Design a protein around this ligand. Sequence first.
Ligand SMILES: Nc1ncnc2c1ncn2[C@@H]1O[C@H](CSCC[C@H](N)C(=O)O)[C@@H](O)[C@H]1O
Ligand SMILES: Nc1ncnc2c1ncn2[C@@H]1O[C@H](CSCC[C@H](N)C(=O)O)[C@@H](O)[C@H]1O
Ligand SMILES: Nc1ncnc2c1ncn2[C@@H]1O[C@H](CSCC[C@H](N)C(=O)O)[C@@H](O)[C@H]1O
Ligand SMILES: Nc1ncnc2c1ncn2[C@@H]1O[C@H](CSCC[C@H](N)C(=O)O)[C@@H](O)[C@H]1O
Ligand SMILES: Nc1ncnc2c1ncn2[C@@H]1O[C@H](CSCC[C@H](N)C(=O)O)[C@@H](O)[C@H]1O
Ligand SMILES: Nc1ncnc2c1ncn2[C@@H]1O[C@H](CSCC[C@H](N)C(=O)O)[C@@H](O)[C@H]1O
Lengths: 282, 282, 282, 281, 281, 282
Amino acid sequence: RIVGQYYDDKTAKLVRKYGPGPRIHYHVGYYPSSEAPRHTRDVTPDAFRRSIRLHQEGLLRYAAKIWGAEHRLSGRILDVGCGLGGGSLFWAQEYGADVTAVTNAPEHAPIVEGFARECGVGGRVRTLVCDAMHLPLDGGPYDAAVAIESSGYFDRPVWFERLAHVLRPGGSVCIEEVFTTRPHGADVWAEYFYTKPATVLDYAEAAKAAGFELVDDVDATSETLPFWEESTAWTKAVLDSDSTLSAVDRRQLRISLMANQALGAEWQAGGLRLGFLRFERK
Amino acid sequence: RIVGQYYDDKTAKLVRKYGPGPRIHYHVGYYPSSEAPRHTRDVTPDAFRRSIRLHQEGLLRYAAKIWGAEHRLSGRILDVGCGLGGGSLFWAQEYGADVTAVTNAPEHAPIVEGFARECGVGGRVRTLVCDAMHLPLDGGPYDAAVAIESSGYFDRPVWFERLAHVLRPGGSVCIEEVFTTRPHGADVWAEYFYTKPATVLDYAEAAKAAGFELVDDVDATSETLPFWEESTAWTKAVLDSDSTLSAVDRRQLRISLMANQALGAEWQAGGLRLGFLRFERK
Amino acid sequence: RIVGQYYDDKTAKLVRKYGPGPRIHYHVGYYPSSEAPRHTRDVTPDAFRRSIRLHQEGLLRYAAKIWGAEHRLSGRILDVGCGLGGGSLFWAQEYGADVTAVTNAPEHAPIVEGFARECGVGGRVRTLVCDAMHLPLDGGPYDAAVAIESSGYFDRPVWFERLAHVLRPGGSVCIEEVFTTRPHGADVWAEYFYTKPATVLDYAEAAKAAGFELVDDVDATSETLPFWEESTAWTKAVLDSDSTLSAVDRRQLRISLMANQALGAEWQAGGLRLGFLRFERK
Amino acid sequence: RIVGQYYDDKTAKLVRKYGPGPRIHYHVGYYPSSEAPRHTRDVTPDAFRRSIRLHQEGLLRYAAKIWGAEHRLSGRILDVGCGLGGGSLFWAQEYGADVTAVTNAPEHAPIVEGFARECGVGGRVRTLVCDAMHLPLDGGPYDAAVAIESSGYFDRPVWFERLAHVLRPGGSVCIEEVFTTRPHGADVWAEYFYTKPATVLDYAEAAKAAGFELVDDVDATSETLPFWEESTAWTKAVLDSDSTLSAVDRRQLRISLMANQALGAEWQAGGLRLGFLRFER
Amino acid sequence: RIVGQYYDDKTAKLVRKYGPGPRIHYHVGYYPSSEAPRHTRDVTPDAFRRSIRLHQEGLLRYAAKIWGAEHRLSGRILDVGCGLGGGSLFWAQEYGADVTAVTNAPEHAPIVEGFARECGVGGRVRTLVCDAMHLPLDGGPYDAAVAIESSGYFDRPVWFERLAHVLRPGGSVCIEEVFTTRPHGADVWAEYFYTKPATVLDYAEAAKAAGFELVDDVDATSETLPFWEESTAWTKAVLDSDSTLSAVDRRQLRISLMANQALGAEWQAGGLRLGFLRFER
Amino acid sequence: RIVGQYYDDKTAKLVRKYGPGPRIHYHVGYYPSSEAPRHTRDVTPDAFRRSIRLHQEGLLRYAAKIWGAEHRLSGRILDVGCGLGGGSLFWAQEYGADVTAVTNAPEHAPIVEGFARECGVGGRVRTLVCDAMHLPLDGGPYDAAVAIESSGYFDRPVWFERLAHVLRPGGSVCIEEVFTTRPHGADVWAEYFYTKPATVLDYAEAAKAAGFELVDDVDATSETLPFWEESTAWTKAVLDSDSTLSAVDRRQLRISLMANQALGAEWQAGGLRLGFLRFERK
Ligand SMILES: Nc1ncnc2c1ncn2[C@@H]1O[C@H](CSCC[C@H](N)C(=O)O)[C@@H](O)[C@H]1O
Ligand SMILES: Nc1ncnc2c1ncn2[C@@H]1O[C@H](CSCC[C@H](N)C(=O)O)[C@@H](O)[C@H]1O
Ligand SMILES: Nc1ncnc2c1ncn2[C@@H]1O[C@H](CSCC[C@H](N)C(=O)O)[C@@H](O)[C@H]1O
Ligand SMILES: Nc1ncnc2c1ncn2[C@@H]1O[C@H](CSCC[C@H](N)C(=O)O)[C@@H](O)[C@H]1O
Ligand SMILES: Nc1ncnc2c1ncn2[C@@H]1O[C@H](CSCC[C@H](N)C(=O)O)[C@@H](O)[C@H]1O
Ligand SMILES: Nc1ncnc2c1ncn2[C@@H]1O[C@H](CSCC[C@H](N)C(=O)O)[C@@H](O)[C@H]1O
């Protein structure tokens, strides 16, 4: 949709906040203690940035553990909604996977190829720019598909049909996602990020219809709540310190801070769930 | 029922361990800090008994909070799988509910009424020896059903259907239960307690087919883990201190001790969720 | 006897787990390398059953070696606490002994004679339902008594006195047993098996007061530890593979699994010795 | 200075609260689960003092764990700001260390010595009534120096210079202290106890300039916050229980309660950090 | 030399014993409990080959554990004396490494390449038909070099010199080998397999003179002694089972049995050590 | 007896073999794996010496663990049969004990005071030269007594009476010792070292008579067997390498080697037991 233009235009802010390096993640970070680190020695934007980065990697490491990526994500896999390729390179390098990276933000694909060349995995990571519900996917059967915080953009009934045609029997669909637990329980997240979160039931119903079984359903809501404290704290540090900010840039950072507070309030209100689902194709 | 007789044989040990009347609870306790109490001066059996009982009440006090017991559990309710009446009297005394307590252990029904009479609520607490998913009940339409750690013995598709007919529109089904998060994630729990734990997804599927919306899905695994520490230390204390135990009782307590360690381990292993659900009748 | 009835109720599970006749053993197996067998290709229940049985025979073959069974256990012997006859037939068949097998489980006496008859040794193996430390036995003086993992149920001061009268000068008492090495070092063993383990010192004191010299005190704790690995893996295999198990049997097997881990832990903790003793009558 | 006299004056009000032991401790307690014990039906002053003393002892056990006192704190050590000798005796008895206990409260020195004898380690524990930033180096090189809640009273640069000359190479300097995490973050603590708390960076800079390497930094703010609830409860239990309290001591106790209430609020406000540090020479 | 031709000749007798996989291994097996599996009622040649292949694979899993192949063996590495490529493929597949596989048996090079494709790592595994002590350094610096049972064929000083120029600083050199523990301790092994086994000290001296630091030394003699019992059993199972064996191959098999019997006796005589070593540049 | 003159005269050989340093032990070493280390890089006498020394320290560390020396051996204790003070300094320094070191070899006491001064524990370690069964012991009640491989020289009935007068109630007697398990089962050890080993029963009988209870009985026979391989190997290395040996010194080393082989053969023949006993005064 317009979401590809919305993801295009914030390329600059993502590299500012979640860069640099070759692996830039754009998803919430995982704090296995449900507590944000205390930042004392160093309260500059770069301190929160590196802490956000490290715990965003912690999210991937945690997922590969509970999903047993050693055998389930080491083969030929789809990285649906790849962002800037942080996840894509993570599977390619940590588990040797051959990755097809999918995005509807064209500005992003060349960045992912750059970063893959960079780490030397350009022969095992490929991008393609299309909608993930209409994608023609040459590349034979894939052993798995991973969606880190992108399935909220998808039509789930139709998306799971798509994956049923391109995933071999017994292949996995691994989803990290914001879900509702009550109705409207993720509205702040939904309206601000142009997503349409549903319940875990909705995902399971749509996946069952296309021939997938739910084999794992993990609640990481409490372990990802600290991400909003760090995300907020970073935004405050930039506003507080950098005096080269134009009035326009300063207002976007302000709007980002205002949103991070309302998102963090929602996260703990009990109406949403940060989940890790894994489906197996029947 | 084999398990109905299993519950009858438990009464004496249930009464000794979960303390005297009038409210005797047979569920896990709720430790809001996810820390076990440090019993530093007094490590007697009665000291762990009291702490276990205090937090078993806390479970109910907590559940009353998240479920809005003041309007949702203050009317004509079903208390399904009622144990020795602890939850029955709680709802009847703390929220004025008219409680119909259901159980398949005949030995327990007179116990509960003898305790309801003692508390001056004998006219608003009656029992029904019963299979939860079978009887007609001519108690007119019901405002709510509560099931605290009993629904694991039930055929959830059939049980929700029963409830659909006896519950009024918008009436609630409130569940505290051990669910699986992946297949086999509660095998110790299942085989030791004759229980058939299922995933929260299955509960939602079964309740939907019967006409119920899931409107709340709270986690409390880490807040109930300290209960296994406390229950293990009670059993250790009794084995260490009580020298008037028959070899038969001592063996049961040694067995209970082994079970409590396996259960506490399983609580931590990730395959298991202690959650609170609330459904609403369409 | 409460424990006599406990042994009667065990027969079916004893027969299933410790393999079919004619020699059915109910003691720990003896692994001379203190290593458990690596079952690399076949991890079926029957594969662990066979290995357990092979090493249960090895226990007897080992004990025959260290005890000089050729001259010491080839005559008129008592086999006290005889189980299902495994040891009885071993001594009768491998060393030509005339065996009087003693037990307090009435269900087991016909089992043993049906197996002695099948092996053509029915005239040199008779049973005696009995308390070990009570009956008169008019089997004339005896050359030896053997007690393989049964003496833990006995009053050792009284039991050695009985034996002193029915044994001839220089006759041997051969014991394999779980002893304590410090108080409480075998509490799991004791409470789960209704047993009263004592230190080797107590056995020596009791046997001295009755007229017996201790002439051999062998350790075999580390050589019998692998048995708990094997017994645990058998139980795991049955739970994993056998889908026709009643909830009752499944629960017993889940309980046995928990017990086997606690026992294997206790075997390693230092409070416990699996030893072989030989006494000689003065 | 006036501080050494300030410690002299509160000797009796401090043996009442934290005594009698032979080990009296004057530092916060360590609650490993980060919550105070629920106190049963005994809510008397002695019930709370016993709990306070318990977790005070636990703080030293925990410091001894993370510092590996087995090797690092079992030799010839300085106990810098020994209070009433509770920490000094601890190292002497639990780790077979020889301890030189430094204080600027001359009244406390006899009390530490008397208690060293009654424990039978008087031949392993001597006192030094002096300023910590002017330590007699006659007495040979020391293995380590430990400062439990005393270093907020020190000129850190100067103190670490003194330590650089009395401590062998590789010697450890083990510190438990209230640090700041931001400016004015420990002002209630500072202005009430006459300390100058500084950040962890300040401490590492001063240690560096004297040849010391920061090798360990543990945050124990959460685990010591309940001390203020037990310390507040004890005070309330005293005002509530004994009606044979003079108006003057009843007002001193009251002021301590208001202080404990202000101190515990600042402990959770974010601006402060109860930390454990170790430097190597 | 004559060795490279000696490896060429035994290609068929070695695919028979240790194939077919796509991973064929030519090193002893690792039996972590130090005893061979009791073989049931299936005592056929394939039953033993499967067991031999199992613990051969386990040796590489165990080496990967103690070497931490996650970081050290997951980059651009040399597989020095790659045999039929079983170890090469292992590092490519299990640790996402890029592998240059060196051998002096030219017949083995196609077999390693063919198997690299069939596993889909042919773009991560190239071969080098050359002498290990004359390695082409064009091909950029390597992260590590691994030598599973090949270094007994090497001039260690010269080989480590070559390694010092092709390996980045901090690069690892991971060796599994038969070492001597005393003079003549591996003579059966040496004279049968055309090797010159040396002690661990010899290896560390030669590595040092080329700038390498010995950082790990594990003794696995006990855990690899059962390989000779399984290897002997397999041979017996073949002589016993198939009566359509030519006299010539029946005599070659017989000689291998006498060899395995002499080799396993020397493995327990004390004079030899199956070891795992790691050097850092 | 003459044993003090026998212990005097081998002062030279003990320092040669088990020195130097301040802690020289003269007891068997403890190898927790029951396997002697493989010595390959370095097979000189000094390699075996240091390995013997290290595992002799391992014996003390193991004993303080199973005896909980932190509270049981940190007080005022008797080190009966102190040798050259290795054990004495170990308790004084590792657990802060105040040690009275007893010996009948006067040449040895000044060596122990030297080594105590040396380590700075001269104020907490004192020697006295007398027979351990007639010793006047001023020094109030002692909290414990330790005997590492010396009680074989003592009259056990009489020695335990002595300890009953000087040990406070609840104090420990900690014995490491060679014991017989069969008669004559330690004859090689006994005749060569002028000891009179008895059974564990004999020790318990004598200790019970003077008011002690046996609370711990550990079998370390298998863990100390490797000591004879190292002790032999050292003796061979000295004979093999050192060419400055006189014919007399070379014959004593030969005689020592011949004895170490016969002692090592006895150790595994099953007739002796290397034990760690702990008695508590009633
Ligand atoms: N309809 C659609 N089809 C394909 N990709 C879409 C899409 N809508 C949104 N996306 C992509 O989904 C991603 C959401 S955030 C990126 C997630 C990334 N895997 C990470 O965690 O690092 C963006 O890359 C966005 O471009
Ligand atoms: N099939 C069935 N039908 C109705 N009740 C059942 C049942 N199977 C088990 N139960 C009941 O469910 C309860 C299990 S635990 C007791 C729960 C109680 N609400 C408490 O927390 O104190 C017992 O009352 C048991 O008798
Ligand atoms: N009081 C008693 N008198 C006689 N036998 C007893 C007894 N108590 C228990 N036993 C027996 O002791 C045995 C325990 S285990 C079975 C042991 C058997 N020798 C074997 O190893 O196969 C059982 O036969 C049990 O019936
Ligand atoms: N300038 C100074 N020189 C030496 N000691 C000082 C000092 N200023 C304060 N102190 C001492 O440092 C201690 C602070 S509080 C006491 C801490 C003690 N280790 C305990 O935990 O119990 C007091 O003994 C105080 O007298
Ligand atoms: N001089 C030399 N240069 C390079 N490779 C050599 C060599 N001499 C022997 N080799 C090779 O080293 C290997 C020895 S055995 C094969 C080892 C292999 N890593 C495996 O475990 O399967 C053979 O491939 C042999 O051809
Ligand atoms: N009758 C006796 N009275 C006191 N000591 C004796 C004795 N007979 C032998 N000893 C002493 O007992 C010791 C035996 S060996 C020394 C053991 C020492 N604790 C160690 O393990 O390091 C010698 O010191 C010897 O002199």
